[PDB]
Structure formats: C-alpha cells, structure tokens
Design an enzyme around this catalytic site. Structure first.
Site, PDB file in Angstrom:
ATOM      1  N   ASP A  95      -0.094   8.649   7.474  1.00 13.55           N
ATOM      2  CA  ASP A  95      -0.065   7.208   7.942  1.00 13.55           C
ATOM      3  C   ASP A  95       1.029   7.020   8.870  1.00 13.55           C
ATOM      4  OD1 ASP A  95      -1.970   5.184   6.997  1.00 13.55           O
ATOM      5  OD2 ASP A  95      -1.223   5.384   4.935  1.00 13.55           O
ATOM      6  N   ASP A 100      -3.104  -1.946  13.296  1.00 17.71           N
ATOM      7  CA  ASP A 100      -3.121  -0.819  11.950  1.00 17.71           C
ATOM      8  C   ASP A 100      -3.486   0.189  12.538  1.00 17.71           C
ATOM      9  OD1 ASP A 100      -4.951  -0.902   8.839  1.00 17.71           O
ATOM     10  OD2 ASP A 100      -3.670   0.206   9.948  1.00 17.71           O
ATOM     11  N   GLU A 136      -6.057  -6.587  11.498  1.00 15.61           N
ATOM     12  CA  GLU A 136      -7.522  -6.173  10.773  1.00 15.61           C
ATOM     13  C   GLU A 136      -8.507  -7.146  11.121  1.00 15.61           C
ATOM     14  OE1 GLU A 136      -6.109  -3.443   7.367  1.00 15.61           O
ATOM     15  OE2 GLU A 136      -6.951  -5.422   6.801  1.00 15.61           O
ATOM     16  N   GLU A 156       0.939  -1.890  10.772  1.00 10.20           N
ATOM     17  CA  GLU A 156       0.797  -2.068   9.603  1.00 10.20           C
ATOM     18  C   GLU A 156       1.969  -1.882   8.584  1.00 10.20           C
ATOM     19  OE1 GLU A 156      -2.092  -2.916   7.641  1.00 10.20           O
ATOM     20  OE2 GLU A 156      -2.468  -1.393   6.265  1.00 10.20           O
ATOM     21  N   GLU A 157       2.923  -1.086   9.282  1.00  6.42           N
ATOM     22  CA  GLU A 157       3.619  -0.107   8.441  1.00  6.42           C
ATOM     23  C   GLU A 157       4.960  -0.678   8.804  1.00  6.42           C
ATOM     24  OE1 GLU A 157       2.532   3.480   7.354  1.00  6.42           O
ATOM     25  OE2 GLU A 157       0.937   2.043   6.528  1.00  6.42           O
ATOM     26  N   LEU A 168      -3.909   3.374  11.198  1.00  5.37           N
ATOM     27  CA  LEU A 168      -4.722   4.231  10.334  1.00  5.37           C
ATOM     28  C   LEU A 168      -5.319   3.423   9.253  1.00  5.37           C
ATOM     29  CD1 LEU A 168      -6.486   6.515  10.304  1.00  5.37           C
ATOM     30  CD2 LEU A 168      -4.567   7.822   9.376  1.00  5.37           C
ATOM     31  N   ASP A 169      -6.324   2.769   9.548  1.00  5.54           N
ATOM     32  CA  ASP A 169      -6.907   2.092   8.436  1.00  5.54           C
ATOM     33  C   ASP A 169      -7.882   3.009   7.256  1.00  5.54           C
ATOM     34  OD1 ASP A 169      -9.110  -0.611   7.471  1.00  5.54           O
ATOM     35  OD2 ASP A 169      -9.566   1.520   8.078  1.00  5.54           O
ATOM     36  N   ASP A 215       0.814  -1.478  -0.031  1.00  4.49           N
ATOM     37  CA  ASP A 215       0.029  -0.094  -0.092  1.00  4.49           C
ATOM     38  C   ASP A 215       0.788   1.303  -0.071  1.00  4.49           C
ATOM     39  OD1 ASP A 215      -2.215  -1.775   0.094  1.00  4.49           O
ATOM     40  OD2 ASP A 215      -2.523  -1.412   2.254  1.00  4.49           O
TER      41      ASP A 215
HETATM   42  O1  LIG Z   1     -11.387  -0.804  -2.111  1.00  2.00           O
HETATM   43  P1  LIG Z   1     -11.427  -2.215  -1.607  1.00  2.00           P
HETATM   44  O2  LIG Z   1     -10.688  -3.095  -2.619  1.00  2.00           O
HETATM   45  O3  LIG Z   1     -12.755  -2.783  -1.440  1.00  2.00           O
HETATM   46  O4  LIG Z   1     -10.466  -2.532  -0.421  1.00  2.00           O
HETATM   47  C1  LIG Z   1     -10.684  -1.530   0.666  1.00  2.00           C
HETATM   48  C2  LIG Z   1     -10.408  -2.215   2.028  1.00  2.00           C
HETATM   49  O5  LIG Z   1      -8.941  -2.129   2.586  1.00  2.00           O
HETATM   50  C3  LIG Z   1      -8.849  -1.190   3.509  1.00  2.00           C
HETATM   51  O6  LIG Z   1      -8.646   0.043   2.842  1.00  2.00           O
HETATM   52  C4  LIG Z   1      -7.671  -2.161   4.122  1.00  2.00           C
HETATM   53  O7  LIG Z   1      -7.037  -2.327   3.129  1.00  2.00           O
HETATM   54  C5  LIG Z   1     -10.297  -1.550   4.214  1.00  2.00           C
HETATM   55  O8  LIG Z   1     -10.326  -0.768   5.244  1.00  2.00           O
HETATM   56  C6  LIG Z   1     -10.985  -1.550   3.138  1.00  2.00           C
HETATM   57  O9  LIG Z   1     -12.090  -2.382   3.315  1.00  2.00           O
HETATM   58 ZN   LIG Z   2      -3.279   1.471   8.135  1.00  2.86          ZN
HETATM   59 ZN   LIG Z   3      -5.944  -0.804   6.970  1.00  2.00          ZN
END
Ligand SMILES: O=P(O)(O)OC[C@H]1O[C@](O)(CO)[C@@H](O)[C@@H]1O
Ligand SMILES: [Zn+2]
Ligand SMILES: [Zn+2]
Ligand SMILES: O=P(O)(O)OC[C@H]1O[C@](O)(CO)[C@@H](O)[C@@H]1O
Ligand SMILES: O=P(O)(O)OC[C@H]1O[C@](O)(CO)[C@@H](O)[C@@H]1O
Ligand SMILES: O=P(O)(O)OC[C@H]1O[C@](O)(CO)[C@@H](O)[C@@H]1O
Ligand SMILES: [Zn+2]
Ligand SMILES: [Zn+2]
Ligand SMILES: [Zn+2]
Ligand SMILES: [Zn+2]
Ligand SMILES: [Zn+2]
Ligand SMILES: [Zn+2]
EC number: 3.1.3.11
Lengths: 326, 326, 326, 326
Positions: C65, C109, C271, C88-89, C111-112, C59
C-alpha cells in the site's frame, strides 16, 4: 529514478521550450519500445527473411525492415512536431500533412544492421533531428543541412539489452529499456569517450580496396612502432553495435572510402551524421579523413560518406596519416 | 507448436530412455530463462561491472558472472540427473551429494563473452554432456573424456533474441525463447552448415603472433588467387555469437594457437568441445589445425585448445595449409 | 492505434491547452504501469501481508500500500503540474515545493481494495483532478471543492487485465495496458452506461444495519413486483472492480450509509467523487440517496460519504424509494 | 527456490513413480502460461465478445473460450500421459490416439467464469485427474468415477496475479506464476483452511428460489443468534475466484440447488469435484447438503451438482440445518 520522459521535460524546463521536442522524443520512444519487442521474438513471429525490395542505395528489405519503418513514420507523424521526414527506405522525403506539421525534420534509419538480424546480432535504429530554418513551405531541401545543424540525435540498440542513446546540445545520456515496466530509465549521463582507445573496428575483407592511409593505419595497430601491445580488433557488422562499443570502451570505428566506392558505404543523412553528432558531443571526433562529417553540406538525401569516428587521440593518429599522404 | 520440452520427451520416446536427460535438459532451460531475463535489464539491475575475482585460467569476474553460475549449478544439482559438474568458474570439479546424483557429467561456461556485456553485445551459455562410464564413485576424472563421448551439447545466445541451440546424436535443432510465455519454442530443425562460406572470423589484432598457416590463410581470404571476391570479416568477441553466425551463414571461425599461447585461449572442456560437437552434428568441422578437437583426451579440466570450426570446405582449405607447412 | 498519450495530446490539441494536464496524466500512467507490474508478482516479490499502520480513517496498511503511494506521490511531484496532493494514506494534504508546482490538485487512493489483495481479487487506483482556483498560496483547502469542480478523473483496474478508465469533460474512454510494449492502448471510447441494469452490487452482511429504503430496494430486486426475473447479485469487495462492472454491464452499486456509520464508509475526496464523475460522464448517476455526490462541499479531506451509482434507471428507482420514506 | 516442476519431480521421487504425472502436470502448466498471457491482453488482442456456440449445459462461448480449450486439449494430448479427456466444451469425451495414450483421465473446465471476462474479473481453469482403472480399451465411462478416485486436482487463477493451486494426496500447495521468467514458483505449501470463517459467498438474486435451509442459513449470517457480528458477504461470479478466497480467508461458498434446478448449476466432473478435492485436502468440506460431493457416482459427464464447500465449521452449521429440515 528518472524516466526518459522526465529527463526531456526537465531539460526543456530551463531551455524555455514550447515542448514539441518532447512530444517528438516521446513519440519516438514508443516506436523503440515497439521495434524492440518484435525483434526479441522475431523468430516465433516469423519476421526473419525478406519482404521483396531493394533500398534506395541498394539493400534487400525484410519484413521487419518495413514494419519498423512504418511505425516510426506513424509515430513521428502523429507527434505533431515534424514537417519533413527522411528514411532509409524511401526514395523521397516525406512531407507531413499540415494539420500534423511541426518545426522538425527527422532523418532516420528505422532498423540498421540488416545483415545481422538472422544471426541475432545486435540491431538498432538511428535518428537525427534538425529545426526547419525556412519560411518556405516545407520541402525535401529542409533535410539538406550540415550535421552541425542538429538539435538532437542518437540511436537505439537492441543488443543483449535495449538502450536509447541520446545526444542533445548539452551532451550524451544513455537510458536503458526496462522490459518489465516498459519505460526508458536513465543509465548513464552525461557520457564521455576515452581520449585514447585499445580497439580497432573495421571490415578487413576489403584490404585489397583500402587506400594507403587506412592500410598504413591498420598495420600500425598490428605492429606498434612504440612496441606497445597491438589494439584488439572488433567488427560486428551493425554500425550502431560498434559505434556503441567504441563509445563506451573507446577506440576507433572505420567505414572508410574504398577504391570501389568513392565515398564509402554509410549514408550521411541518417547514419553518419547522428553518430558523428553523438561522438562529438561525447567529446570524440568524426572525420572522412579529409573533412569533418558534421560540416559536409549534403545534396542528395540518400548520399553516402566515408566515416571515421572515435576517441580523438586515435581518430587524429589516422588524420595525421591521411595528411601525410594528402 | 513444439516446445523444447515436448521435443526431448518425444526424442527420448523412441530412444527408450529412463528420461533423466529430460529432467536435466529441463533443469537447464529454466536457468537459461533466468540468466537471460537478468541480462536484458542488467543495467537497471545494477549488474554491469565486477564482483572481484580472477577465473581459473585468468579472467575478471562480474556480478553477473557469478549469478548465472550459481543458478546453473543449482538447477543441474536439483535435476537429480548429474554426478559431476565442471564450470568456468571453479578451480575444482563439483561432485553431487548422492541423494541428488544422476548418471550425468555436465561441463559448462555459465556466461561466455565476458568482455561484451557492458557494451551490450551478445552473450551466451555453453554446455556439453557426457555419460559417466565409471563404476568408480564419481570423481573429477569423469569429466576427462574426449569430446566424442558427448551425448548432448549446445549453447544459449542472449542476442537480439534469446536462442537455445541443441545438438544431440541425431542432429541440430534451434529453439527460440518466447519472452511472452517464457517457453523455448522450436525454430529450426535439424540444422546444417553450408559446405562453403563467405565470411572469416578472427581477431587480427594478434597478426604479429599468428603462425604462418593462419597468416597465409587470412591473406588468401583478402587476396583470392582465383580472383573471386574476398570473404567478409566479422568478429564480435563473444564466441557463442560468432559460432552461431558461422552456423547459420556458414564460413569459418578461428581462435588459433598464437606464439604467446601454445594452445590458444579457448577452454577445451566447456567451450571448444560443445561447439565442435555442434559443428560436426551440423555437418561442419572442428580442428586445432593438427587434430580433431573432439578426439583430444583432456588432462586438465581447465585446459585450453586452439579451435578452428566451420563450413568444412573452408576448414579444410586451412588444414591443407597447415599440412603444407607441417 | 492510439496510445493514451496520443489521445491526450490530441484532446489538448483543440482545447488549446498549455499541456500540463498532459505531463500530469503522463506522469500518472507510468505509476500505473509500475503499480501493476508489482501486483502481478506480489507473491514472489514478498509484498502480501502488512507494513504496520492504520490509515486515517482506520485501515491496516500493507507494504504494497505504501509502495504505490510513494510512487504516485513521486511521479505527480515531478510532473511539474501539481500544487496540492491528497492521498488515502496521509493525515495531511501534501503541498508541492514551488520549483515543481503546477495548477493541479490531485486527490487519490493509490491502491484501493486492500482486502482483496491476498486473495488475488482485482485492485485499482483512483484519482480525481481539480484546477486550483486560488490566488492564495496553495493550501489544503484547495482540495475542498465539490466534485463538480473536476477537470479529469478515472481509475486503474489491475484485474485479469490492466485497464485505465479516464473521464474528462468530453466523456469516458477506456485504455488497456499492453503488457508487452508497456503502453496504454485505447480500447473503448467514449463509453456509456445502460439506462437500466440487471445486476445489484452491495454487501448484504449489513442487512441488520441498512435503512428501510435500501432494505425495501434490495427486496424489490429479489422479488420483482412486475414478476420479471430478479437482478443477479455481485459484490467483489474492491470498489474499482464493481464500479467497472457496473460501468460496462450496467446496473447498480451501493455503499449506503448504515446505522453504524452516518455516512457510509467510502471516502468522498478520492473514492466517491471520481467514480461519480465517471459515472455521470458515462451518463449514469451518483447519489447518497439525498444529494448528488458531485455537489457536496467537503470540509474534511478524509471524510466519507454513502454512495449509490449506476445506470440511472436503477439509481432513480431507489431515489424514489428514499423519497417515499423521506 | 522451488519451481513447480521441481516439486512434482521430487514428490514423484519418493512415491516411486514412472513419472507421467510429471509430464502431464508439466504439459498443463504451459497451457496455463499460455491461457494467462492471452487473458492479460484480451482487449488489444480483440478476444472479448463471442465466437458463436452454446455449451453442452447451455452457455454462450467466446473466442477465448475456445482458444484455451484447444490449447489444453493439445498439450494434454501431446503429454503422452492421458487416454480420456472431458471438457466443458465438448458433447463427448475425447479419446486419445493410441500412440499418445497414457494412464490418465483428465476432466476440465478450460476457462471458467465466462461472465466475468469482459469486466476483467478473475478467471481460472479447473482440472481433476483420475487413473484409468480399466482393462477395457478406453471409453467415456472411464471418467465416471466418484471424486474420491482423484489422484490430483486444482485450478488456475488469472486474478491480480496468476496462481496455480494444486492438490495431491499429500495436501495443498500454491504456486504463483512469475511473469518475468515464466515459471510457476511455489508460494504456499501445504495449505489449510480455517476451521471457521467470517465470510459468506452466494448469489442472493435467487432468494425467491432457495430452499428453507439455505434461506435460514443465510439469515443466520445476517442476524446472529449469538449476537456476534454478521459474516461479510462476497460473491464475485467466478467460481475459482471465490473458492480461492474461501480457501485462503476461510468461510463458505454456496451454489446450492434451487427450485428451478434440482441440482444446482455447477458441473460435477470438472468444477465441483476438483474444488471439493482441494477443499478436503485443505481440510475443509464439500457437500450438496445431502451427500459428500466426492462420493457421488456420476452418470452423465456433463452433469451438474449443488455444492457447498468451505471451512468445515461453517459447512457443518448448514448441514445441520439441512438435517433439521430433512
Ligand atoms: O467489505 P466492505 O465492508 O463491503 O468494504 C469493502 C469496500 O472498502 C473498500 O475496500 C475501500 O474501503 C472498497 O473498495 C470496498 O468496496
Ligand atoms: Zn488505498
Ligand atoms: Zn480504497
Ligand atoms: O558488411 P560491411 O560491408 O562491413 O557493411 C556492414 C555495414 O552496413 C550496415 O549494415 C549499414 O549498411 C552497417 O550497420 C554496417 O556497418
Ligand atoms: O578478445 P579476444 O582475445 O579475441 O578473446 C575473446 C574470446 O574470449 C571469449 O570471451 C572467452 O574467453 C570468447 O567468447 C571470445 O571469442
Ligand atoms: O451468476 P451465477 O448464476 O451466480 O453463476 C455464476 C457461476 O457460474 C460460473 O460462471 C460457471 O457457470 C461460476 O464460475 C460462477 O460461480
Ligand atoms: Zn535500415
Ligand atoms: Zn543501416
Ligand atoms: Zn563464462
Ligand atoms: Zn567463455
Ligand atoms: Zn469454461
Ligand atoms: Zn465454468
């Protein structure tokens, strides 16, 4: 960097504590965050004015005054760390219901500087903390120790900023309330007063009442025999406000006994003692003119004492006077 | 209910304005919201201390002091409503680049009470507003009008709360800053001073320097010939802080001329005039002891004046004295 | 009434703790207060955009972040209660310098919902906490326990409000951040999911990639064989945002394995596990379609897992499907 | 740098206005500051739940919903700049008492995304502004103009941040609410949508109800004939939330007419029009599939319309479909 909270946990770290100072000091801080928030909007929040009662040594209460008192009472109570509480605003010592008891006796003035609040001058909260020394199931008397029996004491200043001054056996450290993240961040450690000051802080409206020592002293500041410049004057009306300025700039603060009141106006338990403790742990002095405040053994919780605190050089100059007239 | 903003638009409503008071007063308020925010965290924000310069009549500048000055300069500038600006902190009047010009001359002390800030005493901002009376392309002299030529004046107090005091031909109304929604909400309209007060507010550290009138006066408050109780004393060190308390509780405030300074210490343009205007529009007085402050025609922008303001009964008592010694 | 802090101290009260959950949970909350403050002004604070790096499972990082990650790292570190940290990071587990070590392994994580931040959709922080079970001087492997080995887990939602969801062996309690006094106040205890929901939450942009079970399932929600009304759809893009809505309104959330990714996209450690733990402690389920998430023994810290969580009735309906196709 | 307020005064500067857009837009912003403050603590403030009424086109009201409506009503009223008001929440157009009348008709949804609020998803306020074109003493009909008769329109997003999107004949500029000084600061000017997007935003829970065009369209995004990657899906449930993401990331948003509702669900006056105006002034499109939304002449204030808005390339792809099936 260092939150208030971190600081106590670290201090307790090597003092090998059980840590109920920590909850207790943590249960205080939120109140401090709550008192202060309200104060900053005390006008829109329709808090300025009066509730309707006279405090134990004869003061007129205000809605705020009760608000903060309750709050502090509540958070100390739930801290699990205190057995006996003394407040400006209650005739009688509060004992804590056993499930919530702790080894701590906390004296306190929930909101000092009552006068000031309508005119938006600085206001503060004052506390002092003792360890119960008693087998005896806890009683009012557990509060009647000399100031020298303090384990921790300081005050909150809701001035232009909000500030938490804390004195602990180790010394004095100031934290400042970050309004944004609502956390007490540490601004000065480990504080010390000037050996000598340039400012004098007293109510000269009682000139007619002062004793000869204070009278001679005040006049020495206006007419220096050495021909040095005369001290500036400053008296805000909020003890916490003045103490603090005395603390950071140095100099003297006086609420001396007058003709009218054998022992001054300021309450020993939750006003005079804390400020003396801080002052001494900052390296200053705190006298009545006759005795160290810290050594007075109280008999009445709600009792008053004259108080002279400050840079020692200044506090001594006076003592010397008082001695000359003894 | 009523925001500051609503209030001016409504007032301007029936005064049949073009409304550039309004932008101007609106361009001020945000600064006030900006100065204040910073002040409340001036410690974590590492603002306490000094920048490095001496103000025009000889004061030591601090980072804050510049910060707020710039800001106020900027917002007035962009208000589109001002042609000439005078500040504590600049040798010379500021003229405004024509595209942004307005009919307004705003004098001001961006942050008064410099001393107080480290000790977290209350601090404030002060302003006064005149209409340009001149055909002449705008110059410094447009600021040299007497105080009686003010269309609007007041001050901001960053005390325990933040407050905006405004005086306009119609009278005095106080607003209080709601920290939460960041809007100036109206707390008192349309304010008035007591005919007589119970408090006296002066620096007695210059006892040795005062003239006989002030000297006799101060002593009358400590030893009432009528045998009434003697006025309480109060002197915070921030003019805006004291003025305000004088304003809400009544009484007197004095920064009299001393032996040392023919005309006192406080600047006429952006300190003395605004406070006098307010005081008179609150129904109080503002004298040097010899002249109404409002009537003095200034010659130097940065010029000082002795000032005695307050409940009229008190302000007169003194005048009478000064007259007796004339 | 009850602060977050009070609540943990009380819970720890009768669980007869040493209390380093408490510092730890208290060291978390401030971060949460710090992350959130920044997020609400991430625009004026020039934080929207990118720092410059690709996270371990691929990512693109943003200044924010990193900011929150550092912060969380720092506060956990100084909590004195954690030995191994997973983020995460960072490629690699963080071990804690012995003076600061505690019995705790915190996965997280910081900041998700990275995508969401520029468009101001809700964002959150996610954590899970295990007890070290090892004699062995602490290592990365201390993090490789199944989700069932959690002592505490939840998440922060910086939505329209800021909210702290916490799950502990005893159940689920939500607190909401009071911006004013900056304290986490308790809004719901002890929370539970509907047995059956009305909403389905998945990214249907991967329709072409889904397996037959998800495909049949999604179609059952659009064309109910019972002829009931079809579930509403909702997919915000921030897992914490959706989980939460699933939690309070009930229904299902799916990040199923697709053709492209054998095991889905969402990271197991910080997560999938936390959200499952919460879900189960709320009384819901958390499956991959083949296994309980909570029971998977991880081998790679940074490893992914497909995840289906929600009201059990719904989560079962699917399982049943997956079983039918097994 | 530039406050919202500055920006409008400057724009009005050269448009040679009388300036009552300005008061009006200034009277709006405070509400926006008030709605938002409350929302961020809607939990401690006990606002989540319901008041007790069904909105005109059949929605369940919540305490908040009324709160913000009143507020907006009040501030527009006192702005002195509006004669006729239309709200989500009132059967009937509001006329303004003559002393307060202005040349402005403001349509508005005080708080959109009702569903979302308990789950803390983003919520917003929506407005559109027309000039009265009538001699006639003001009536309800003054609101029945096409969207093309807008002088100004935008919306507030209480997301992770608070944001004010404004569209004026000149284009689109976003401001972001600084929580600290409570001022709307300008973050993007003068905004534009991508010619083509990567995301699709619709409720597929009504798959069974959609017409063949939407059905074919949605399937084209999941199975690209060009074999490009399929659009991501996103549907939050708050129109303002999605519109905004569409606006900043580009792509499409659809609330198409279904079998059940001849004309969709979203209200023309204070939801569909504003968003279309913005979209077109951002350089995107806003169609029902048959007509430009902006050109529809309304007959019922409270009337609905299907709406498809977004990056034009995408919005056209669909139109083309709808045309193919016409
Ligand atoms: O846009 P996508 O492929 O559905 O993925 C978004 C997902 O990824 C995240 O941003 C973490 O990767 C989640 O919070 C979110 O559900
Ligand atoms: Zn994050
Ligand atoms: Zn995340
Ligand atoms: O106005 P006086 O008589 O000087 O008393 C004011 C003093 O009383 C207090 O308000 C507490 O009584 C102090 O904070 C302050 O110093
Ligand atoms: O300390 P002094 O000499 O009394 O002067 C303080 C005065 O100066 C000011 O700080 C401005 O010079 C005033 O606010 C205050 O009254
Ligand atoms: O849940 P649905 O049927 O998709 O409707 C939600 C829509 O309704 C609104 O809440 C207003 O009715 C919009 O903000 C949102 O797009
Ligand atoms: Zn008190
Ligand atoms: Zn007191
Ligand atoms: Zn100044
Ligand atoms: Zn000054
Ligand atoms: Zn609405
Ligand atoms: Zn709506």
């Amino acid at each position: 960097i260092v939150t208030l909270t971190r600081f106590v946990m670290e201090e307790g770290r090597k003092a090998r504590g059980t840590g109920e100072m920590t909850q207790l000091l943590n249960s205080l801080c939120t109140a401090v965050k709550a008192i202060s928030t309200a104060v900053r909007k005390a006008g829109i929040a329709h808090l300025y004015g009066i509730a309707g009662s006279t405090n134990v040594t004869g003061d007129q209460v205000k809605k705020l005054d009760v608000l903060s008192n309750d709050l502090v009472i509540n958070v100390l109570k739930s801290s699990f760390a205190t057995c006996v509480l003394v407040s400006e605003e209650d005739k009688n010592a509060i004992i804590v219901e056993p499930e919530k008891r702790g080894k701590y006796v906390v004296c306190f003035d929930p909101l000092d500087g009552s006068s000031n609040i309508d005119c938006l001058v600085s206001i503060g909260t004052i506390f002092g903390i003792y360890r119960k020394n008693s087998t005896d199931e806890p009683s009012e008397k557990d509060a009647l120790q000399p100031g020298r029996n303090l384990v921790a004491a300081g005050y909150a200043l809701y001035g232009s900023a909000t500030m938490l001054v804390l004195a602990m056996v180790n010394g004095v450290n100031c934290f400042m309330l970050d309004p944004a993240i609502g956390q007490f961040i540490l601004v000065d450690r480990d504080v010390k007063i000037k050996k000598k000051g340039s400012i004098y802080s007293i109510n000269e409206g009682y000139a007619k009442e002062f004793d000869p020592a204070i009278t001679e002293y005040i006049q020495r500041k206006k007419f220096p025999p050495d021909n040095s410049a005369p001290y500036g004057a400053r008296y805000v009306g909020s003890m916490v406000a003045d103490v603090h300025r005395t603390l950071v700039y140095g100099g003297i603060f006086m609420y001396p006994a007058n003709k009218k009141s054998p022992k001054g106006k300021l309450r020993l338990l939750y006003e005079c003692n804390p400020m003396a403790y801080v002052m001494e742990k900052a390296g200053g002095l705190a006298t009545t003119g006759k005795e160290a405040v810290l050594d007075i053994v109280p008999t009445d919780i709600h009792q008053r004492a004259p108080i002279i605190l400050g840079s020692p050089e200044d506090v001594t100059e006076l003592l010397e006077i008082y001695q000359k007239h003894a």
